[model samples]
Target chain A: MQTIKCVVVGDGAVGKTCLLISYTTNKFPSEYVPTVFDNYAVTVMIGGEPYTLGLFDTAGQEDYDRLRPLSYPQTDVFLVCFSVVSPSSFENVKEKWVPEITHHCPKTPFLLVGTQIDLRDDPSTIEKLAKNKQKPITPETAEKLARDLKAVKYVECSALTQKGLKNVFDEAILAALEPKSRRCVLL
Target chain B: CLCLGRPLQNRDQMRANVINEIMSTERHYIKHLKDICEGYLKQCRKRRDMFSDEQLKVIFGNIEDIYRFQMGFVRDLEKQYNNDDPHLSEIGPCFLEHQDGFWIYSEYCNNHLDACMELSKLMKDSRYQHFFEACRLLQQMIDIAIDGFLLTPVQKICKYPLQLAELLKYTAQDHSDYRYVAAALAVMRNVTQQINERKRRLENIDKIAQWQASVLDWEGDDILDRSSELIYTGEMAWIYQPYGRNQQRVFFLFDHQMVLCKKDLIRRDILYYKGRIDMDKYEVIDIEDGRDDDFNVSMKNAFKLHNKETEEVHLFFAKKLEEKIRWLRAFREERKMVQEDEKIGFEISENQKRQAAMTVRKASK
Candidate 1:
């Protein structure tokens, strides 16, 4: 069976690892045991053909600035994630992560994913953002950025309740296997 | 020369006695190696159902090879020894001229710790009850346990230079054997330090792995993978608000990065990795001794870290002034640290600097 390599990259504390873990375990794991990175595999069946979707995770923190590239090679697709509540993390999606993956795998497809939507509706998160004079990123705004950055699509999810979680990876596999909508349109 | 006024003949006798000790110890060491080979290792195959082949590999770890190699060296040492007439043949040349062969001990000594660990694991199992003990008694070895027999070679390998130096002390400076003995001691000392360095490095790597395992919420890779040393470890805290309480975070400074972790309040052994600062972009600046008048907090025993890459500022406060100073000292000293002819911190290769020569400067462009 053909294997699809999907690597997740984003700013620190943007729920990248949580995104992969929740998707693989089919549950939100509140208790975390810190490890380097747990690359997961899911046997994805599409159109009666089984494909091993190898989901690779990485810490998008300063500690891994040098070592993160070791996980980039042979990545068929990337899930460039940012937390919906963290405005700085959202801005960094375009500034840092998009450029980072594009430079490494120029031809590979990517999906713009907004993580931790559960925090988007929480009162405490709203009050904290109110203090900063900010609001959660609107879907239309992320969708525009996705089109501007030439991402295959924009998908958002909540790792806590698993809201819109399944489609995030479903779109990732769709973007990897069938890249008709990826990169750029015809001239 | 007349400080003690001792007879010169006794000095010569002591040197000859040291030579005699070397030969006798070689014979004894060879016998111990043979016991581990013929007794314990050979017995493992007979009861093959007990240990898997991989277990046997790690447990023995080329002891049979060491036995054959040392057996050759025993002949080399014997060829130079005077059997009947002591001191007639020079034994000093045996060490200097043939010291290259002693390097066989490096591999044996390097993995000697794992060999013992594997043996200890098996000894505790009820399935192999007294299996090692039977091997010990069957060989009629002087050591009570099989591990006891295993430790003799590790000690004997390091013991050579000490004995050679003792022999050097009594031999006259102008004697035919003095130069050879002195050179052998020098050569053997160098080799011993190299072997010790390999063993020490392995222990340090294992220590880092154990420390990383016990930590909670760790997201980074093996810290020491790209780093040479885990330079400093201590409890530091970001001076929170002015309520008179502090959440002290344990900070670890590595060669390549700085990691901040919090101790799990419920679990005493685990550390929760809070975050890390890349060593490439951070500048450690000392803060003055004062109090924050607006927040009514003590600014004493404080330091600041400025992240040039992200323009982020972090504050740290330590209770004792010494603790604060040491953390800064480790930070500052690490940038230019050259530990024992090897660079351990703040790595930016000259080639990289040159490639970015168009903009590379004191500050990131």
Candidate 2:
């Protein structure tokens, strides 16, 4: 079986961990806990061949900025994530997350992920966002940003409800198996 | 209760059987902890002069604390077992309640397993070798008990889901406590999942040990002494001939020195003692291609090992660019650390001499 190394990075509370927990174990994390460095592996079949999807989770806290890139080497793909409900997290996806990953791994392909879409329509959540002159990010806006940043595609998921979770990873594996232009730059 | 038929009796009997298993194991486990503390550690304490005071204190202190905590644990288990409360009767809940205590004890024992092993070897040369020998035997016994008994809590926790699953199979949905059993099983399944996840993290820690054993020829349960630590290991061609073919050699870098060895067939290869360079005696220099025009060396990644006093330069070639840079960087770091330690040692002795001279002057006066 072939192996694809995927790393997840975003701001501190963009639901990166819950997205992984939901994807791998079929359970959503109900608690909020900061990550250090956690890794997960799943056997996924793509194009009738088994592939090991090695998922690496990184801390988005400023404290781990130096240490996070240690896992960036040998990465076949990256998942740049943010929460749909948090505009600041979306902003940092471009300002902070993209620059850091591109600095370490210039040639690896990445997917832009908008998480927690289940909360987008909840009355309390929308009201809170509206109070701050903000709204949940729509697909059009996210896709435009993805195009501008040269991401493979913009994908959204709700880990709590398991909405569109499978496609996010499917697109990632496809990106990893793409043509040679996105070849890995040696560390 | 007496009017209930044979099936009820079987259920009660199974419950009693499970409780007995837990009680018996707890008794034996606590007894082993006591032996480690009162027997083995006390013996080591008697011949305290055999080992450093700090080491003995740490080893004895960690064991004593664990022994006392486990004694309390045994008492708690017995108290619950003797009670008639059905909620307290189950082993899973009891184990779950004291999970932290068990985890702490296991971690403490794991931390000292190597120290105990090291002392076992080092004690043979001590003044009271005979007494230390007896202590070593007891330590060995404690090591066995640690592997067997200290792991009970984790094993017990893992066994809960299976045990609950079995119980659920025997019971019908209409049974009075079926929901309770199902809830307990759900909770335990989650607990076991988390335990397995954490175990994976712990398993990853052994990757370094595996690498060390494979690369550095470290034997089973080997411990590196305080003065020596593995710095780096990689294959490098030793530029055997300036303008001829080079021989590939495995290099082992340590804090104090570097050893290049020829790989052997079965056992540890022969250490090239002649090629060994003490960090203090030599300086590492990066060899640039075409710069030193005297030698017609074709190797790309080469470095010079220039002896300080002898002023002799020996060229070594690393197969990869990163390996060459790491060799130079690691050598400099190790050399710098050793020099700092020596400087502190010199300062302490010089201060002692100054104090001695002052005392002598006062005596003369």
Candidate 3:
């Protein structure tokens, strides 16, 4: 058996815990809870072999920013996540997440995960964003951002509905196994 | 005068001289042990926090046993001389009877030699500066006694064969005590052979302390290895910038890790600002002999350390060919040990799973 450590980083309340709970336990957590540092482990079957897939959830608040890099040393892959329904969280994908992870683990691969896809088409969610003159981040936009940011791939999932949930982690494990490059070479 | 620069005395006078020297030196050894136990070690015990309990056991407990054992041997030697003064020497074979007892004392000396070396180095702590000073003073007194105590039990055994041979040369073949002295020499030769066999099985941990002191300039508790075992250490220059200045740093190889450090200018005797990396995460790459036409720098042997999962790369060079090979050997051995640890970890996990499955079957039954 092998262990693959996957660390999730993004803004606060972007559904990082909900994503992990939904993946590991197959139950969508319905509570709004902030994490200091939480961990979840699940035995994943890949190619007829068992791997201990360790999911590490970190607090994304500014208070925990200094303490975050302590867990960055030996990470296999990073899940740089943002909610599709939250435009500000999407902006942080470039503003903070990419720069931070690259600084700590410059060579480690990371996935640009577009979370909360269930709300992408919801009437209430759309109305709330439309009032602020914004729309849910479309897949095309997210995929382009992933390319620009040099992510292995862009993956979107809805933890609430478990839609495209398994693919998100499968792609993560794949990125961890075969990372392309440490930094983006802009040409 | 004999070749050793002293006129040969009669066999009894010569025997008496050897006994007197042994007893007088034994007395001084016991006195120094008592002084250390009562003086410096007593203060250490009162402080309690200065040394770990395990260290106290190794240092004081071992020394106390040696003191007690040797004191008893001294008493026995005195009693032997008092009880049968003329008859004992006339037979000349009397010392062979005490061989078994002295052999046991030699074993104790062998066991405590490592502890003595460790204590002598560890007492250099600033918190225990006075203890270090006290030990130095005691050592001066020790130098005056025994003159040169054989450093190890094997060495002590080696001394006996030479001394016995000298005595044999002074005695005629058919002398009354000749057979006795010959028998004692044979017993000592056997004892030496057995102890030598035991010595071959032991690794000299004292070499680690000496290496730490002389090479790393490690003092006190700063002499720690992250893996708890130091494998190798040497000085090499790390290329801080490509074709720029190569900063000289000391590299230490532990059981499964490497630490790069620089010596602080004010405290040039000690290492400082250590940067440690796990051997599993880093890979050595781009190793090549230096070329004469290289831009800003030219060195004999050069290599780079590349992080396997990350893009961090470090360049290093050695001025001498031997230094280059030394670094290469250390890295190779360090990598070998890390792989061994990983294999062991995997095996243990598999064993655990096997046990768990067996438990499940038992529960079902």
Which candidate wins on lDDT?
Answer: 1
Two-chain complex of model 2, DockQ on C-alpha atoms against the true structure: 0.01
Worst lDDT run of 10 residues, candidate 3 chain A, spans A28-37
> Can you write out model 3's per-residue Cα lDDT over B1-365, one digit (the tens) per residue?
33532233576655555544444544555666566556556656777767788767665545555556656756665654544563244323445765765555345444454454455456446556565455546555321111012122223334454445545655667766678777877787666654543332122233333444444433334223334346678888886445666688888777557767788778887776456667778777747775523435655678777888876767787778777788778888777756765674622234433443354355342
Clashes of 1: 0
* Clashes (N, CA, C under 3 Å) per candidate: 0, 0, 0
lDDT of 3: 0.62
lDDT of 1 by residue, B1-365 (tens): 33532223466676666777677767877887887889988999788789788888877777788898788788988988876756545667777766777776677776665665676566568667477767767888642355545555555655566667767777788878888888888898777676665455544654565566667677967565555457788887784333545668888887668788887779867778888778768788788888654345678788777777665666788889999889888987666543432542335344533333323232333
Worst 10 residues of 1 chain B by lDDT: B353-362
Least accurate 10 contiguous residues by lDDT in model 1 chain A? A178-187
- Each candidate's DockQ: 0.01, 0.01, 0.00
Q: How far off is residue A1 in model 1, in Å? A: 61
Candidate 3 C-alpha error for residue B137, in Å: 51
Clashing pairs in 3: none
